[PDB]
Amino acid sequence: MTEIATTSGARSVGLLSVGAYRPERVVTNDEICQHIDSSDEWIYTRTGIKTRRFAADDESAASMATEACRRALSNAGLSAADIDGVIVTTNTHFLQTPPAAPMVAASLGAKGILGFDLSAGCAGFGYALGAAADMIRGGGAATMLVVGTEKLSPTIDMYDRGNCFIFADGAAAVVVGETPFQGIGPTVAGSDGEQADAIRQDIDWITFAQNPSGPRPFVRLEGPAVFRWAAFKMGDVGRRAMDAAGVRPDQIDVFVPHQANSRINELLVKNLQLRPDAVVANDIEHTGNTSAASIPLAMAELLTTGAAKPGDLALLIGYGAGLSYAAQVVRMPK
Amino acid sequence: MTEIATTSGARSVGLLSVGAYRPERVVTNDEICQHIDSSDEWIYTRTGIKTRRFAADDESAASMATEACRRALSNAGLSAADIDGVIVTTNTHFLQTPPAAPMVAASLGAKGILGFDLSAGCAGFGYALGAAADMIRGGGAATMLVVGTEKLSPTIDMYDRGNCFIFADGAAAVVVGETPFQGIGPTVAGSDGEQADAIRQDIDWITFAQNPSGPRPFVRLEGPAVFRWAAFKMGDVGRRAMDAAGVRPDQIDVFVPHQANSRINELLVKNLQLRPDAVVANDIEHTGNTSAASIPLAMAELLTTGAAKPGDLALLIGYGAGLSYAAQVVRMPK
Ligand SMILES: CC(C)(COP(=O)(O)OP(=O)(O)OC[C@H]1O[C@@H](n2cnc3c(N)ncnc32)[C@H](O)[C@@H]1OP(=O)(O)O)[C@@H](O)C(=O)NCCC(=O)NCCS
Ligand SMILES: *SCCCCCCCCCC
Ligand SMILES: *SCCCCCCCCCC
């Protein structure tokens, strides 16, 4: 007997810019491996990693996230004032509450804008990019900041001969806003719950809290299970992303898969049938697996080098913990 | 050349149903006052809480969340098969990773459907409804379970005379899907990072993990600051929620504020200039504050008691940690 208004926002949205932040401390394979039993070679050939960046003690995912935003905003040619919202996506904010998002907002000068934390393993960014495009088109925001941020350092077990050499630290954000032409395709996402513990924190925080004498919680990865999963499944997930975007594989300019493993991403490239000249993201060689921050960071590295250029038609594929996956086709920012 | 394609979905969406789970174990006011200097009369008058529910030890944000989803699914007349995505929104998932959302989807038998965790303090549910609808309108999903779940019992310092009686346990899910007529108005939200520390974890998990034998983290609350905040700021918040929906104050039949404290909520009622006979959610009486679970648990209480009616016009205002608020106008579910 009484109507709730139906509204709408702008129909064309894109990645206005990207802005990266990588902590200054460089951690070679020799440093990493000398505390287990391995070698430079052994790590390089199984993963693709050479060096990785670890954050300083006083740095957090929120701090790094703040610095990332500032740069995206700078690159987008905008102030904090132009932003209606921030989505902080991450798995390494070490407080149950308050959420990182508002803190990131306050640091920027836009104290009062909307914002939340989003958790979907490594594929968080994919879901965040996704959620922002839907919110702008819905008419609940005109311009937004989405930031992938991570400080995985303190979570690594230095005695874990499987994954201590994998995870690293950093942040990178995109300004999502209205563009003349459609810049972000429809989100393609899904997951696999049976295999949740493939990538996990081994002990919950409260169980750890109630029994201090036990072992502390560290990150644990089941290599073969996660390799197999991503390597043989994300190809089709990649095809759907382009299916929804109305784009043929021959037309993909830039391939940004999550930087978990160079061997995984090598297999996905053959599988996806791209041009022989398609620019594959390989930021992992000097960044490592920065989880939810991988793709945006990876975008900026391709951008920094020139291998990718603003407007290039990019396939973004994210896969990781929870066994989650979120892909879209996008145009390149900056 | 080569344009990125857009998808579109249902123009009008709404709360098809609500499913609620509260754990069997009642904890009385006297029982709370064992490890603090207080009484039943002191707690009830200053909060409006008489009793609350504490979860069993084998339970969790995920277990509870799952139970709530079934209850919702059953009320809407749907099975897992009908769901395309799930959003778990919590502050008491005690794993940095993996997200609860996948494990929850798995538990229901929708193993591969999309989803993720959303963290925005107490206003979590507000954002999650907002993102759910936004996604469905953008055509990335046709029908979604949004579940707010919380196991706060283990985060409570039983010696905290300031809050040990405030927080409780439970979960509640809604089903969002297409409806004949508009059922959820735009989302109005925002934050206050300056006062990020009003509701908090006092010690992050990493700091604590490197010093396990010392003080462990609990939830902290700066009573007056949050009272003062909510009591004088949520008025215009709600006003904005009714403005976007194209409804007047006199038109709201059911007010559902976040269940922080009955006093705060009575002042909201007055400030909002609702009808004298408008129905006001007071689920706190035997549920206490369940953060991101409160609003939808409230919706359920009113429906169960026949105090609210399906399709009744409703105003939802969420407020809490990070200093985050999300609010919308909706028609009542179930
Ligand atoms: C903190 C709160 C409980 C009131 O306590 P308070 O008066 O600020 O506590 P103080 O430490 O200043 O002590 C003041 C007095 O209260 C008395 N007191 C008695 N029982 C008390 C109790 N259970 N808790 C706190 N104070 C109590 C103290 O003895 C003290 O003595 P005095 O009045 O003779 O000086 C109040 O802010 C409150 O109701 N909080 C929850 C409701 C709320 O604001 N919720 C928003 C949550 S999101
Ligand atoms: S997809 C990989 C993301 C890694 C997140 C794990 C966070 C660390 C958990 C151990 C405390
Ligand atoms: S709005 C209330 C949000 C508080 C969530 C409780 C968990 C916070 C960490 C306490 C250890």
From Swiss-Prot, chains A, B:
The keyword Lipid biosynthesis applies. Signal peptide: none annotated. Pfam families: ACP_syn_III (PF08545), ACP_syn_III_C (PF08541). Its EC number is 2.3.1.301. Keywords: Acyltransferase, Cytoplasm, Fatty acid biosynthesis, Fatty acid metabolism, Lipid biosynthesis, Lipid metabolism, Multifunctional enzyme, Transferase. Pathway: Lipid metabolism; fatty acid biosynthesis; Lipid metabolism; mycolic acid biosynthesis. GO terms for cellular component: cytoplasm. One of its GO terms (biological process) is fatty acid biosynthetic process. It catalyses: malonyl-[ACP] + dodecanoyl-CoA + H(+) = 3-oxotetradecanoyl-[ACP] + CO2 + CoA. It is found in: Cytoplasm. GO terms for molecular function: 3-oxoacyl-[acyl-carrier-protein] synthase activity; beta-ketoacyl-acyl-carrier-protein synthase III activity. Residues 259-263 are annotated as: ACP-binding. Its main location: cytoplasm. The keyword Glycosyltransferase does not apply. It is an enzyme of class 2 (transferase). The last Arg residue of the ACP-binding site is essential for the weak association between ACP/AcpP and FabH. Catalyzes the condensation reaction of fatty acid synthesis by the addition to an acyl acceptor of two carbons from malonyl-ACP. Catalyzes the first condensation reaction which initiates fatty acid synthesis and may therefore play a role in governing the total rate of fatty acid production. Possesses both acetoacetyl-ACP synthase and acetyl transacylase activities. Its substrate specificity determines the biosynthesis of branched-chain and/or straight-chain of fatty acids. Belongs to the thiolase-like superfamily. FabH family. Homodimer. This is Mycobacterial beta-ketoacyl-[acyl-carrier-protein] synthase III.
